Design a protein around this ligand. Structure first.
Ligand SMILES: NC(=O)c1ncn([C@@H]2O[C@H](COP(=O)(O)O)[C@@H](O)[C@H]2O)c1/N=C/N[C@@H]1O[C@H](COP(=O)(O)O)[C@@H](O)[C@H]1O
Length: 232
């Protein structure tokens, strides 16, 4: 599936910065109108300040579409997850916290269920060829590999994993490897999509979701054409 994405800062759509206007709902509705089944939102305001979590806006955007929306952005506490889900969010995307407190997040899986949580992994292939997990782009590796963290959450029923290469299209070999090793996990690719050929390159990798952000905002292609290429 194609997963259109938007980055939000105080109700503003931004390139990750560059402004794209403060009217995200018509964009999302048109995305869904072209056949999109899932949408993706990153709350950068809430990621910076937890008390600034754009819950009312998210609640409006969710109510404005007919498709499940997965939302992430500095999700730190069990209360953050509950608040987002209560706002109508389908799945909560968790990156940093899932790396720093695995035992706590594993408790979240037990309470909320694996259908409501998405494990986001920022991955850098280091000097040794290890798929290192990082909490952000401006910080060093954490000393934990993708395999270690994935197999840590498998006992609590891990299903959805968002994998971003932060070390030009998407890293095809990367996704081919991880999707084959963990066939019981629906992997989502993220970052790298520059044109329509980048989507075609991921068709046989085994990924179940392709997240596209910029390419849509810059008119490289439409969601419709993306889905057409994806379904071949
Ligand atoms: N400062 C940030 O930019 C940031 N901070 C966190 N995230 C993501 O949020 C999620 C949760 O992060 P935490 O706040 O829990 O650590 C993870 O997936 C992170 O990668 C961030 N990523 C934002 N942009 C995303 O990166 C990808 C780029 O795609 P492209 O346009 O097609 O090229 C898309 O998925 C975009 O939505």
């Amino acid at each position: 599936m194609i997963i259109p994405a938007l980055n939000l800062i105080g109700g503003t759509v931004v390139r990750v910065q560059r402004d794209y206007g403060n009217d995200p709902l018509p964009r999302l509705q048109d995305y869904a109108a072209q056949g999109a089944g899932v949408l993706h939102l990153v709350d950068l305001t809430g990621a910076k300040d937890p008390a600034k979590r754009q819950i009312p806006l998210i609640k409006t955007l969710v109510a404005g579409v007919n498709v499940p929306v997965q939302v992430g952005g500095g999700v730190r506490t069990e209360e953050d997850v509950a608040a987002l889900l209560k706002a109508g969010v389908a799945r909560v995307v968790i990156g940093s916290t899932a790396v720093k407190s695995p035992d706590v997040v594993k408790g979240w899986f037990e309470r909320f269920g694996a259908q409501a949580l998405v494990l986001a992994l920022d991955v850098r292939i280091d000097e040794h060829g290890t798929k290192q997990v990082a909490v952000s782009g401006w910080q060093e590796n954490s000393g934990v590999s993708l395999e270690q963290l994935v197999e840590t959450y498998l006992p609590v029923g891990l299903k959805h994993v968002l994998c971003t290469d932060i070390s030009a299209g998407s890293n095809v070999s990367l996704y081919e490897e991880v999707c084959a090793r963990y066939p019981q996990i629906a992997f989502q690719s993220s970052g790298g999509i520059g044109d329509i050929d980048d989507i075609a390159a991921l068709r046989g990798t085994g990924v179940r979701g392709v997240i596209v952000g910029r390419a849509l905002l810059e008119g490289k292609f439409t969601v419709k054409e993306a889905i057409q290429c994806w379904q071949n």
